[PDB]
Amino acid sequence: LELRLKSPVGAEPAVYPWPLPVYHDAAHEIIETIRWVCEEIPDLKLAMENYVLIDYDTKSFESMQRLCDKYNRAIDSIHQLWKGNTRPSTGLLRHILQQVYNHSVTDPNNYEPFSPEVYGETSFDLVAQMIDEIKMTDDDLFVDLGSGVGQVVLQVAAATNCKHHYGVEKADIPAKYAETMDREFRKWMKWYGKKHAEYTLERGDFLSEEWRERIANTSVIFVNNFAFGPEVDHQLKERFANMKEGGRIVSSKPFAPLNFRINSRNLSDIGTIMRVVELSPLKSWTGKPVSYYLHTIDRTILENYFSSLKNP
Ligand SMILES: COc1nc(Nc2cc(S(C)(=O)=O)ccc2N[C@@H](c2cccc3c2OC(F)(F)O3)c2ncccc2Cl)nc(N2CCNCC2)n1
């Protein structure tokens, strides 16, 4: 006893075992998948009997099976008509990321702010605003320092053309889940027929020796440093100090003051080599009044100070 959804692009079907997983709801996931594919393919919305998406019982195997059958037959008609890899829309991507999470993370957890279990609530929209603001290209290398189950990396890889996206996570439980998130994401993206950039989710300590040169060569760092201690903050600034001009750090708490004024007593501070701006979706956003910080490596701040001493 199972439910099957045929892929709109001819990939392997999505197979769900009945009784469906508890999770959000698995039956609603199947209905929303069908609706998303219908929104995506106008011939499919035409071929599909309208009534089948109004009249359903998620608690009935036969009712759920009939819904899947109607969709599957409509996909078959469309595949017969066509007989004779684009990036996902923002709406579809939100669905795909939630779907990937639901199929990957199965054990209870605590639902703290910006935690994997609440990604859909404020993270998804905020990461979407951030992507629109920093405008990465094929020359960029993106790294999430403390990537959790890899959700930010998956979103950014599905939305941008960076050369590569990396996620590094130290903790055992999220890094293990990231392995399933990776598989589930690649599988589901193929199922929908959607393109994503290259990415790697790995287990590791971003403060290790190996990671020193990796951070130095990164063009865009993403780091939720909100709850970081002074030691991790100090070590990170030491890593950032080796970054290239124009290198960027997107964070939840600033690494240098917004009003940093270089003088003779603060030449050791990271503020001497980076621009820092506070960004806010509120500056059409109706979500939480959130803020984030964009840091840009710029050693001309330090150069202009020495230049001004020699040229009064
Ligand atoms: C407010 O409570 C709070 N906030 C944060 N973090 C936080 C605070 C604020 S603010 C100043 O209060 O407005 C805004 C954004 C974030 N996090 C964002 C984020 C971080 C870095 C760059 C960003 C970004 O968003 C961005 F895309 F724009 O660029 C985030 N982190 C992780 C995954 C997805 C997302 Cl989207 N972390 C914690 N914790 C630490 C974790 N476990 C519980 C306590 N608790």
Side-chain angles (χ1 to χ4, degrees), residues 137-152:
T137 67
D138 47 24
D139 290 320
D140 286 300
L141 283 168
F142 178 88
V143 176
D144 183 356
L145 300 182
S147 48
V149 304
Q151 290 157 314
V152 176

Side-chain angles (χ1 to χ4, degrees), residues 113-114 123 126-127 130 222-224 226 250-252 290-292:
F114 300 97
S123 304
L126 188 50
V127 170
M130 182 276 296
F222 179 103
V223 58
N224 185 24
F226 191 84
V250 189
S251 75
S252 44
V290 295
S291 263
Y292 65 105

Side-chain angles (χ1 to χ4, degrees), residues 264-279:
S264 66
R265 291 141 272 134
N266 64 17
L267 294 177
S268 314
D269 298 356
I270 197 91
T272 63
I273 64 158
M274 58 173 54
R275 305 277 178 178
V276 192
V277 63
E278 178 178 4
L279 301 165

Side-chain angles (χ1 to χ4, degrees), residues 7 192 218 303:
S7 165
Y192 290 100
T218 302
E303 193 272 2

Side-chain angles (χ1 to χ4, degrees), residues 27-48 53-54 56-61 63-65 67-69 71-84 86-106 108 112-120 122-171 173-175 177-194 196-240:
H28 289 129
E29 182 201 290
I30 289 150
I31 291 137
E32 293 163 25
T33 297
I34 293 168
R35 290 183 131 93
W36 273 116
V37 179
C38 290
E39 184 56 32
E40 195 64 40
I41 313 175
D43 284 325
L44 183 71
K45 187 174 266 171
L46 282 181
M48 188 131 179
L53 286 155
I54 290 159
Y56 63 79
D57 182 354
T58 64
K59 293 262 264 136
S60 161
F61 181 53
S63 169
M64 286 301 292
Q65 205 176 33
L67 168 94
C68 290
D69 186 55
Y71 163 85
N72 285 345
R73 285 225 192 133
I75 280 290
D76 292 335
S77 301
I78 290 335
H79 284 175
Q80 291 298 321
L81 176 71
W82 295 350
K83 229 163 201 160
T86 180
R87 295 204 110 91
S89 68
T90 307
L92 180 59
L93 185 56
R94 183 196 306 276
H95 168 82
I96 294 176
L97 296 178
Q98 191 55 67
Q99 179 163 52
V100 168
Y101 179 93
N102 285 160
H103 280 250
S104 308
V105 191
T106 37
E112 52 258 80
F114 300 97
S115 78
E117 328 91 61
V118 298
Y119 195 84
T122 297
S123 304
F124 183 90
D125 298 309
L126 188 50
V127 170
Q129 283 309 141
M130 182 276 296
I131 287 162
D132 290 341
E133 179 67 40
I134 68 161
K135 298 167 202 74
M136 295 170 266
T137 67
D138 47 24
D139 290 320
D140 286 300
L141 283 168
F142 178 88
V143 176
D144 183 356
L145 300 182
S147 48
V149 304
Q151 290 157 314
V152 176
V153 171
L154 301 179
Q155 185 168 351
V156 178
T160 83
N161 76 308
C162 292
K163 216 178 292 166
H164 212 96
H165 302 77
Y166 297 88
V168 60
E169 182 49 63
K170 200 184 179 180
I173 304 155
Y177 276 138
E179 299 179 356
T180 311
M181 290 286 294
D182 178 20
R183 288 190 283 272
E184 283 291 327
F185 182 78
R186 291 182 202 270
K187 176 201 72 176
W188 277 112
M189 291 287 279
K190 284 193 214 80
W191 190 95
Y192 290 100
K194 303 294 154 170
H196 57 86
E198 285 307 279
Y199 74 85
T200 304
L201 291 181
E202 54 188 276
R203 190 197 272 239
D205 185 0
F206 60 73
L207 293 183
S208 74
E209 286 305 297
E210 172 228 358
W211 268 93
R212 282 187 180 274
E213 214 63 70
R214 296 185 64 181
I215 290 161
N217 295 323
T218 302
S219 66
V220 186
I221 289 270
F222 179 103
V223 58
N224 185 24
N225 67 321
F226 191 84
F228 288 3
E231 203 46 40
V232 170
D233 167 81
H234 174 83
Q235 288 307 310
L236 272 182
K237 292 175 177 164
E238 178 179 310
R239 307 313 189 263
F240 301 154

